[PDB]
Each structure stands twice: as C-alpha cells, then as structure tokens.
C-alpha cells in the first residue's frame, strides 16, 4: 500500500503568516490527493480536492498544488480560527491512506495566566481523598511552572497537569494542576499553595487557602 509522508509534524505560526505543509507519496498518485482540516473536538472538514481545487465555502487563503508524488497545502495568511490538525489523503488506489497530520500552534503575544485555586470539596473529603486543583486561565505561551507547596514545603510526585488546546479566538491555553493526597495527609497541614512561574509574570504568583477556611 501507498505511504503518504506528511511534513512537518508541527508548525508554529504567527497570525498573518504563511503555513506550508507537504505530503510525499511512496508511488505516483496522479492528482488524487485531498487535504482536511480537523479542529479540536470536531470531525475532519474537506478543504482541497484533486490536489489543487478548493472545496465549496472554503476561504481563498487555502490553496494546494501537486501531481505524482509531491503535494503541498498552503494557508497564505493564517487566522486564529485556523487552529487545527491538517491531514492529506490519497484517493488514487485502495487502501486509501492518510498523512500523519500537521499540528498547528498559533504564535501570539505573551499573556499572563489568571490563577485560581480550589480546596477539596466536603463531599470528596468524606470519602477519604483530597484533590486540590489549581487553574491557570487564558495564557500564552504554553511553557509554565506550577509548584505545589504545603506549609511552604515543596511537593514532588503527587500532582498531575492537563492542558487545553489553543483557543480558536484568543490563541491562549488553560492549564489545570491537581494535587492529590489522602484525607489523613490533608488534615495534617494548614496552608495549600500553588505557585505559578510564567514568562508573562514579572515574579511568580501564589494562590493559597487554609484547610478549614472555606
């Protein structure tokens, strides 16, 4: 079967800038190449077909070209709403095969997180566990250090972080960090602090609460 080799795997672009994605077929596929856009949480959307025709309703910034083995797809002036993974696909002969995808990250101006902290709920505590959640909202770039401190003692090995996809409008990320401990350990300590270090903060920001405060 025909291998479609799609490059780059990742692309960092400022809005207004150009995106060029390439697919190379392990053998000739004439012009039976299509390009798809898949935004987070959505199904693929057809953008370009027979390698160079743009589908109905797709804006002019989207082009493609190529024949045989070498195919490219272009977004001339990338918009925040173009945040997606893009895929090529070979229609020429079965099995129809897809490129591995290209993930677009949109470069923007630095934006500091707003930081929020959440104590464990009364209901969860009843069950023997304490989850403490720190939220970093609407920031850029993704790079961020979140440090948990309990009674000013730095934590290690007992937290996990999750990050959202870039927002289609403001191009920011949000991030959750969840500190997990036993109810017994939780009740042994007073101060629960999340400390955030980020390029957009002139100095790390700490949000905290006392066990029993809320």
């Amino acid at each position: 079967s025909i291998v479609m080799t799609q490059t780059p795997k990742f692309l960092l672009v400022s809005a207004g800038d150009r995106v060029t994605i390439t697919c190379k077929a392990s053998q000739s596929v004439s012009n039976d190449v299509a390009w798809y856009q898949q935004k987070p949480g959505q199904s693929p959307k057809l953008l370009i077909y027979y390698a160079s025709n743009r589908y109905t309703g797709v804006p002019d910034r989207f082009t493609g070209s190529g024949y045989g083995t070498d195919f490219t797809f272009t977004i001339s002036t990338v918009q925040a709403e173009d945040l997606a993974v893009y895929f090529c696909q070979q229609d020429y002969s079965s099995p129809y095969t897809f490129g591995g995808g290209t993930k677009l990250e949109i470069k923007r101006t630095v934006a500091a997180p707003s930081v929020f902290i959440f104590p464990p709920s009364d209901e969860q505590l009843k069950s023997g566990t304490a989850s403490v959640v720190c939220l970093l909202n609407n920031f850029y770039p993704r790079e961020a250090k979140v440090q948990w401190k309990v009674d000013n003692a730095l934590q290690s090995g007992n937290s996990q972080e999750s990050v959202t996809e870039q927002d289609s409008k403001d191009s920011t990320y949000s991030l959750s960090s969840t500190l997990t401990l036993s109810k017994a350990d939780y009740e042994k300590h007073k101060v629960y602090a999340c400390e955030v270090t980020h390029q957009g903060l002139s100095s790390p920001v700490t949000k905290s609460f006392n066990r029993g405060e809320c």
């Binding site: 709920s121 969860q124 989850s131 972080e161 999750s162 959750s176 997990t180 949000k207």
Partner: protein
C-alpha cells in the same frame, strides 16, 4: 446534508459490534460510502468502502480488517453499516461514516475494545469563591474523578453555557483510572441568581450525573 453514526461502545477483545450510519438530505443510493476510523496512536485510517447497485455493491477493506469486518448498505433506508467481528484492541478509535469524495463527515461513534471492567466517575464540585475570583469574574467547575475507560463528556446547564468553558484532557492517574476537570469563568455577580450545573455523562458505566456547584463564602465578608 447530514450523516449520523451510532452503534459504538465498550466491548471485550474477540467480541462483536455493529455500527450504523443514517444519511439525509441527499440521494444516498448515488454515493459510494466509506468507514474511516481515528485513534491518537494510529491517526486516520480508511477501513471499508461500498459502491453502488450498478457494481452489485462492490466492497473493499483495509488489510487489517479483512475477514473480520463487513460493510453493507440499505438504500431504501439511506443507511450504511459496519459489522465488526473478532475485535482487537487496536480497532479502538472513533469511527466516521463518509461518502465518496469525503465531502461531509458525521460526528463519529466511539468503539473501545478492552478487557477491563468499567468504573463510573465521582463528580465533585469546584466551588466558586474569593480564591477563584479576579476583577469581578469567578471561576467554578466540576472534578470528574476515578472512571474507566474514556470518554466522559461534560456540559454546563444542559449546553446553555458554553462561553468560558474549558474541559481539560483526561489524565491517567497512577491507579489506572482517569480524572478530569471542567471549569468555566463567569461574572461573580451571577453567583447569586444563576444556578451552575455540570452535566456529566460516562456512557460505558451508564453514569449520567448533574452536579449543582454552589458558591462558598469562606471569610470574604470579614
């Protein structure tokens, strides 16, 4: 023009499942139909195709599904189906139904092939408070913890609330059970008149849960 997949779910390796896709707003009998699947690890993979009455409904299959999967259609019901036998772990993914030219796609239907038993989540409030308030905005949310397998879906006030929502990718805990948070930022003035409810659905365990998230005062009045 619309397609809708159903039939997906959780199944044991070696098990069987049938997916369905119903079309409307086009002349179905005129279109070749495809099933395509997607997983993070493997990406997009074409699975099966069925052609027209003319062809005597010619079918083709990806090597990896040959002898196990059968595509069929019912033109009189504008429907295409995928019968899946002897399911493998690697058949896990979201399955999409798409016509020739892949002009349009459905919402997809999730197949999970796993020997593990299911576990429904607990849903805990992330209460809004002074600790999650900045400049007249408050953040609140819900922690959906200790479930297996993926996915859960989270909505707010039955989908009436979408602005400012961030539902985070689940993370695998050291226990092997998933956890995720969904948050939203809202006017802090809203807290007094608006009820905030996270609607949680983990279909594998038949969990359908609505959790009202109530504000906490802490010592803000002091």
């Amino acid at each position: 023009m619309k397609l809708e997949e159903s039939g997906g779910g959780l199944v044991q390796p070696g098990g069987s499942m049938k997916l369905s896709c119903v079309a409307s707003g086009f002349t179905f009998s005129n279109y070749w139909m495809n099933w395509v699947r997607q997983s993070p690890e493997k990406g997009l993979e074409w699975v099966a195709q069925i052609r027209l009455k003319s062809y005597n409904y010619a079918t083709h299959y990806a090597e990896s599904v040959k002898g196990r999967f059968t595509i069929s259609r019912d033109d009189s019901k504008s429907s295409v189906y995928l019968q899946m036998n002897n399911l493998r772990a690697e058949d896990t993914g979201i399955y999409y139904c798409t016509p020739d030219g892949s002009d349009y796609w459905g919402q997809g239907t999730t197949l999970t092939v796993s020997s593990a038993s299911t576990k429904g989540p607990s849903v805990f409030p992330l209460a809004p408070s002074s600790k999650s308030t900045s400049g007249g905005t408050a953040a609140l949310g819900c922690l959906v913890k200790d479930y297996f397998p993926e996915p859960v879906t989270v909505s707010w006030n039955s989908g009436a609330l979408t602005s400012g929502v961030h539902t985070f990718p689940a993370v695998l805990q050291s226990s092997g059970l998933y956890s995720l948070s969904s948050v939203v930022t809202v006017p802090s003035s809203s807290l007094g008149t608006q009820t905030y409810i996270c609607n949680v659905n983990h279909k594998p365990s038949n969990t359908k849960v609505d959790k009202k998230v109530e504000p906490k005062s802490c010592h803000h009045h002091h």
